[PDB]
Amino acid sequence: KCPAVCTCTKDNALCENARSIPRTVPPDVISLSFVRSGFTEISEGSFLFTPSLQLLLFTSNSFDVISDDAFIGLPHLEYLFIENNNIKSISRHTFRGLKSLIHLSLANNNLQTLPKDIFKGLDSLTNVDLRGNSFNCDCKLKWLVEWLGHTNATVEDIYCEGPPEYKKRKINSLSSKDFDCI
Protein backbone atom coordinates (compact mmCIF):
# COMPACT_ATOMS: atom_id res chain seq x y z
CA LYS A 1 0.00 0.00 0.00
CA CYS A 2 1.01 3.65 -0.48
CA PRO A 3 3.02 5.11 2.43
CA ALA A 4 1.21 7.89 4.35
CA VAL A 5 3.79 10.55 3.40
CA CYS A 6 3.24 9.62 -0.25
CA THR A 7 0.59 9.91 -2.91
CA CYS A 8 0.56 6.95 -5.28
CA THR A 9 -0.83 5.77 -8.59
CA LYS A 10 -0.10 2.45 -10.27
CA ASP A 11 3.10 3.79 -11.83
CA ASN A 12 4.07 6.73 -9.66
CA ALA A 13 4.73 7.75 -6.07
CA LEU A 14 5.17 11.33 -4.88
CA CYS A 15 6.50 11.59 -1.35
CA GLU A 16 6.53 14.80 0.67
CA ASN A 17 8.01 15.62 4.09
CA ALA A 18 9.36 12.07 4.38
CA ARG A 19 11.38 11.56 7.57
CA SER A 20 13.26 8.66 6.02
CA ILE A 21 13.27 7.07 2.57
CA PRO A 22 10.30 4.78 3.01
CA ARG A 23 10.94 1.06 2.56
CA THR A 24 7.24 0.47 1.84
CA VAL A 25 6.77 2.22 -1.53
CA PRO A 26 4.94 -0.32 -3.74
CA PRO A 27 7.64 -2.32 -5.52
CA ASP A 28 6.07 -1.95 -8.99
CA VAL A 29 6.29 1.86 -9.16
CA ILE A 30 8.44 3.15 -12.02
CA SER A 31 8.71 6.83 -11.04
CA LEU A 32 9.40 8.10 -7.55
CA SER A 33 9.75 11.69 -6.28
CA PHE A 34 10.84 13.21 -2.99
CA VAL A 35 9.94 16.79 -2.13
CA ARG A 36 10.64 18.81 1.04
CA SER A 37 11.90 15.64 2.79
CA GLY A 38 12.90 15.27 6.44
CA PHE A 39 15.79 12.84 5.94
CA THR A 40 19.27 14.30 5.58
CA GLU A 41 21.13 11.32 4.19
CA ILE A 42 20.86 8.87 1.31
CA SER A 43 22.91 5.83 2.25
CA GLU A 44 23.94 2.88 0.12
CA GLY A 45 21.20 0.71 -1.33
CA SER A 46 18.41 3.12 -0.37
CA PHE A 47 16.12 2.09 -3.25
CA LEU A 48 16.45 -1.67 -3.34
CA PHE A 49 12.78 -2.20 -2.46
CA THR A 50 11.76 -0.48 -5.71
CA PRO A 51 14.03 -2.24 -8.21
CA SER A 52 12.00 -1.30 -11.30
CA LEU A 53 12.38 2.49 -11.07
CA GLN A 54 12.89 4.25 -14.38
CA LEU A 55 12.80 7.76 -12.94
CA LEU A 56 13.81 9.33 -9.64
CA LEU A 57 13.30 12.97 -8.64
CA PHE A 58 14.65 14.84 -5.61
CA THR A 59 13.69 18.51 -5.32
CA SER A 60 13.50 21.06 -2.51
CA ASN A 61 15.33 18.83 -0.01
CA SER A 62 18.27 19.24 2.37
CA PHE A 63 20.87 16.47 2.32
CA ASP A 64 23.91 16.01 4.53
CA VAL A 65 25.38 13.20 2.41
CA ILE A 66 24.46 11.25 -0.72
CA SER A 67 26.59 8.17 -0.23
CA ASP A 68 28.49 5.79 -2.48
CA ASP A 69 26.07 3.33 -4.14
CA ALA A 70 22.97 5.28 -3.03
CA PHE A 71 21.37 4.30 -6.34
CA ILE A 72 22.69 0.73 -6.70
CA GLY A 73 20.23 -2.04 -7.64
CA LEU A 74 18.43 0.20 -10.14
CA PRO A 75 19.46 -1.26 -13.52
CA HIS A 76 16.43 0.27 -15.29
CA LEU A 77 16.87 3.80 -14.00
CA GLU A 78 17.02 6.13 -17.00
CA TYR A 79 16.25 9.55 -15.42
CA LEU A 80 17.69 10.95 -12.20
CA PHE A 81 16.81 14.54 -11.41
CA ILE A 82 18.45 15.98 -8.34
CA GLU A 83 17.46 19.66 -8.52
CA ASN A 84 16.92 22.65 -6.22
CA ASN A 85 18.35 20.99 -3.11
CA ASN A 86 20.86 21.85 -0.44
CA ILE A 87 23.51 19.14 -0.65
CA LYS A 88 26.50 19.12 1.69
CA SER A 89 28.37 16.24 0.09
CA ILE A 90 28.19 13.86 -2.90
CA SER A 91 30.57 10.90 -3.12
CA ARG A 92 32.81 9.48 -5.88
CA HIS A 93 30.61 6.39 -6.40
CA THR A 94 27.23 8.03 -5.76
CA PHE A 95 26.11 7.08 -9.28
CA ARG A 96 27.85 3.70 -9.52
CA GLY A 97 25.75 1.02 -11.24
CA LEU A 98 23.60 3.44 -13.27
CA LYS A 99 24.60 1.96 -16.63
CA SER A 100 21.18 2.72 -18.16
CA LEU A 101 21.03 6.36 -17.06
CA ILE A 102 20.08 8.64 -19.97
CA HIS A 103 19.61 12.00 -18.29
CA LEU A 104 21.16 13.20 -15.03
CA SER A 105 20.31 16.56 -13.51
CA LEU A 106 22.34 18.09 -10.72
CA ALA A 107 20.92 21.55 -11.49
CA ASN A 108 20.40 24.34 -8.96
CA ASN A 109 22.00 22.64 -5.93
CA ASN A 110 24.65 25.34 -5.30
CA LEU A 111 27.33 22.64 -5.47
CA GLN A 112 30.84 23.97 -4.95
CA THR A 113 32.66 20.93 -6.28
CA LEU A 114 32.20 17.47 -7.77
CA PRO A 115 34.46 14.57 -6.96
CA LYS A 116 36.70 13.11 -9.67
CA ASP A 117 35.22 10.31 -11.80
CA ILE A 118 31.67 10.94 -10.47
CA PHE A 119 30.36 10.16 -13.98
CA LYS A 120 32.57 7.10 -14.51
CA GLY A 121 30.71 4.24 -16.20
CA LEU A 122 27.56 6.25 -17.05
CA ASP A 123 27.74 4.96 -20.58
CA SER A 124 24.13 5.67 -21.60
CA LEU A 125 24.18 9.39 -20.72
CA THR A 126 22.89 11.74 -23.41
CA ASN A 127 22.23 14.71 -21.10
CA VAL A 128 23.70 16.16 -17.89
CA ASP A 129 22.44 19.36 -16.30
CA LEU A 130 24.95 21.23 -14.14
CA ARG A 131 23.58 24.80 -14.28
CA GLY A 132 22.70 26.77 -11.15
CA ASN A 133 25.58 25.53 -9.03
CA SER A 134 28.48 27.42 -7.45
CA PHE A 135 31.56 25.58 -8.65
CA ASN A 136 34.96 26.55 -7.34
CA CYS A 137 37.39 26.42 -10.25
CA ASP A 138 40.43 24.95 -8.54
CA CYS A 139 42.48 21.77 -8.90
CA LYS A 140 39.61 19.64 -7.53
CA LEU A 141 37.53 20.66 -10.54
CA LYS A 142 40.22 19.91 -13.12
CA TRP A 143 38.71 16.53 -13.99
CA LEU A 144 35.34 18.14 -14.82
CA VAL A 145 36.92 20.41 -17.40
CA GLU A 146 38.49 17.38 -19.08
CA TRP A 147 35.23 15.44 -18.88
CA LEU A 148 33.28 18.29 -20.52
CA GLY A 149 35.83 18.23 -23.32
CA HIS A 150 35.44 14.53 -24.07
CA THR A 151 31.82 13.63 -23.27
CA ASN A 152 29.24 13.00 -25.98
CA ALA A 153 26.52 14.02 -23.54
CA THR A 154 24.80 17.38 -23.99
CA VAL A 155 25.82 19.75 -21.18
CA GLU A 156 24.84 23.42 -20.89
CA ASP A 157 27.33 26.25 -20.44
CA ILE A 158 28.23 26.57 -16.77
CA TYR A 159 30.36 29.12 -14.95
CA CYS A 160 32.81 29.33 -12.06
CA GLU A 161 31.49 31.12 -9.01
CA GLY A 162 35.01 31.12 -7.54
CA PRO A 163 37.85 31.74 -6.87
CA PRO A 164 37.50 35.51 -7.51
CA GLU A 165 39.94 35.55 -10.46
CA TYR A 166 37.78 32.86 -12.09
CA LYS A 167 34.31 34.19 -11.26
CA LYS A 168 31.89 34.10 -14.22
CA ARG A 169 34.43 32.31 -16.42
CA LYS A 170 32.81 29.63 -18.57
CA ILE A 171 33.99 26.26 -17.24
CA ASN A 172 33.33 24.65 -20.62
CA SER A 173 35.94 27.01 -22.12
CA LEU A 174 38.70 26.18 -19.65
CA SER A 175 41.72 24.00 -20.37
CA SER A 176 44.02 21.85 -18.25
CA LYS A 177 46.36 24.76 -18.95
CA ASP A 178 44.13 26.85 -16.66
CA PHE A 179 45.14 24.50 -13.84
CA ASP A 180 48.67 23.67 -12.83
CA CYS A 181 48.20 21.32 -9.92
CA ILE A 182 51.42 20.24 -8.13
Numbering used by the authors: 41 to 222
Could you give the paper's own sentences about this structure?
LGI1 is a 60-kDa secreted neuronal protein, which consists of the N-terminal leucine-rich repeat (LRR) domain and the C-terminal epitempin-repeat (EPTP) (also known as EAR) domain4. ADAM22 serves as a receptor for LGI1 and is anchored to the excitatory postsynaptic density through PSD-95 scaffold. The LGI1–ADAM22 ligand–receptor interaction plays an essential role in AMPA-type glutamate receptor-mediated synaptic transmission via PSD-9533–35.
For this mapping, we also determined the crystal structure of LGI1 LRR alone at 1.78 Å resolution. Correspondingly, the C42R, C42G, C46R, C46F, C179R, and C200R mutations disrupt intramolecular disulfide bonds in the N- and C-terminal caps of LGI1 LRR, which are common in extracellular and membrane-associated LRR proteins to stabilize their N- and C-terminal edges.
